[PDB]
Please model this.
Amino acid sequence: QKIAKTFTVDVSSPTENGVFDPASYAKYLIDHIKVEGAVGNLGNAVTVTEDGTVVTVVSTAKFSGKYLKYLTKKYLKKNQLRDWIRFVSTKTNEYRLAFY
Amino acid sequence: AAQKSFRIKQKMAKAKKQNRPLPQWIRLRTNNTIRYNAKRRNWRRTKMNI
Amino acid sequence: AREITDIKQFLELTRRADVKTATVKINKKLNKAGKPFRQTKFKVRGSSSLYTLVINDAGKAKKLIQSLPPTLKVNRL
Amino acid sequence: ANLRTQKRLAASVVGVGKRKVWLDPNETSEIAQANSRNAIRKLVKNGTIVKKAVTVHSKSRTR
RNA sequence: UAUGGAUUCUUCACGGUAACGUAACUGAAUGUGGAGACGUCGGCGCGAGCCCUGGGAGGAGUUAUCUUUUCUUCUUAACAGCUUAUCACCCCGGAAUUGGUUUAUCCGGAGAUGGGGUCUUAUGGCUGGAAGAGGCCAGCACCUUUGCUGGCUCCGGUGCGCUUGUGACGGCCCGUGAAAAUCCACAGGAAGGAAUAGUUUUCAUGCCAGGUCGUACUGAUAACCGCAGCAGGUCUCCAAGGUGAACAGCCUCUAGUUGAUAGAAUAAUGUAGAUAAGGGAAGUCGGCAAAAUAGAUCCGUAACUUCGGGAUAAGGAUUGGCUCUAAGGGUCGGGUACGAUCAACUUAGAACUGGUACGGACAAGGGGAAUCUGACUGUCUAAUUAAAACAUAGCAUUGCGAUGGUCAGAAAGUGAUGUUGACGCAAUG
RNA sequence: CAAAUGAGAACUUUGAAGACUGAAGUGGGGAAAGGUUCCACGUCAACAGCAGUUGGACGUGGGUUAGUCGAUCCUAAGAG
RNA sequence: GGUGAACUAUGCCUGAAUAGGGUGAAGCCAGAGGAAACUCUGGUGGAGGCUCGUAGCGGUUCUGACGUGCAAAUCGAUCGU
Model:
């Protein structure tokens, strides 16, 4: 009813490869979270916090790993750094951006 | 057919055994005029129709 | 292929004189959303049937594995 | 070479069609050597033989 | 074939008013009864799978822009227990102010309604089988027929949906839609049976064995037959999305194939497919061939008729897209006349809009007035005749009462009709 | 279209593209029939009405595992 | 004197197959008119060797293709059911 689902996104590999901008990534996520069909309505429901190596998104409204991956891949396509980043989940809701 | 009888299967086995070419050494045997198997069979050419 | 209900039934089955192998399977199921518990399945293999006893109490399962005779072949996996 | 056997084996091993089985052109020699189901499974794991994705049939217009 | 269980000094069990229940709970001769065991069609109900769909957990695609997006995995066998049923049946009771009730009108003083129960287990649910399996993901030692470790595999919804199975029903017949093996049960009561032990192997557990032959593959525009790797013929099961009434017609997923000698050019004449000014059958044996018609909704529909039809008669109008409007349901109730979740596809209406187009491809009747003929449905000259020919129901005639009629056989202690009997069989028109 | 194989490639293999069958299928299986056509290796003199390195061809071999699926048992029209 | 019902004709036995529409029979329910007799209306239901039309079965016309054919009878359209 009011549980706070958390979503970890490791950004360590691209941020230490120095081709990523996790600050702008978190900005894109927070400005493009769609709640009730419109962006900008994060009424203290979906909150994005960044430390430079992990992006944590805490949600009470409708959020999903599918949406997180879809937005992340949209950002990767916009920054044309696909074939370089893969959004992959290690365990439940603790995804990671892999370079190799 | 898949569901055969043992009589039909025995005839099949005999036909498969008989269908082989001449051993090479009968040709070298003396006073021999046999050059090949003249009773050779192919499943499309001639049906044994048993 | 047959459930067991009571520990007495399990005990008569294990002394049935034709069972020699027990398999202990651990299932990490959920009873409530925030309480994933450890379920233990004691499988006694009779000649005709495979009897299985479900135990949701870890203490009960430990006392069961300790109380079964050491001559019978127990296989935990 | 002649990888008809390997294509049929890969389809039968990975449970998809020969229309989905992809065989690496650069690994023709290795695929040809691979003549058993065990070797076809080894190549599939190794990445020489890959299942092609199912061709898309969207239901967006229907929806 | 022993053990446990049940039964036994009330010898072969108890419980329930009853339908009946349970772990068992003797049962010969003989008899009897069930299952085996049965058509077809129609709607209705239920279930299985599939289809559709919401959330969530992975993977892939698209990302000039848009899309909490598109595709994709999220599975649970035989078998064992508990539970689960329309129908049926039992107990109490005693009904007109007749009530109950199906989509379908049947059922009740031969006992309805109502209350309470019993059974079949189709079928579903839970657990075991069983997550250990399968599946979807991520990572490890650097050529080498090598594995290992981590997660996840979850919770729902919907319907005149498709197909299949089942159920309770209803229609049809001068047609009423196999047999046997086999298995069980009942009636009866032969025979036998006590006590440190008898019986029960229809209760549970336990021991042993299960032979012979087939099994590969095609099953067809290349594995069969047609002289062949022949455009022919040859029985059947499963059956996704959209359009649409629709397993045709068109397009697409899974799966499969890309096979049919090729290259160049584009004369006549051909084969197949089209179009055409004005006329509109003048062509021709003859409208042959083609064209026009065509779906759906609404209106309207003649002569004649065996009252059933004719009839889609004939003949008219409409049809898109977008924005709306309205109607049509299920489940949850009552101080101390009415409310909320749950978005399901049908119908009707109104503006607005456009090169007046809109069943926009596909699909898809031409119609009318008569004459001859056969009533109709049906059948035949495989490979030149599908007809008015044959058949048909209807009508009429004929023979025959069994030691018989009609027919068969060389004969027969032989046959068909005939498992028959004049409302029949046989023979004709 | 391009690689590979090959003396030789319109026809073989692989990859890419374009297509078709479109679930009373050109899909998955069976019945009759066939009889080894199945599968692998080698190979192209003949055969596949062009070609062929390919093949249902040629040569050599491998392959069909049942108490539970059938037959086997029953009876039908009938035969005897 | 023998051999054929593997094609086909007919009977029997035992199996199997057959979208979606149109029409709308009996049976049944409600209503209206009428003094009555009765008549009429709206539903329901789902009959038929009924009908349009797939699969199937057949084979009308083109007197089309072909006619030293794919084929000793097929192919295409159009058709019957």
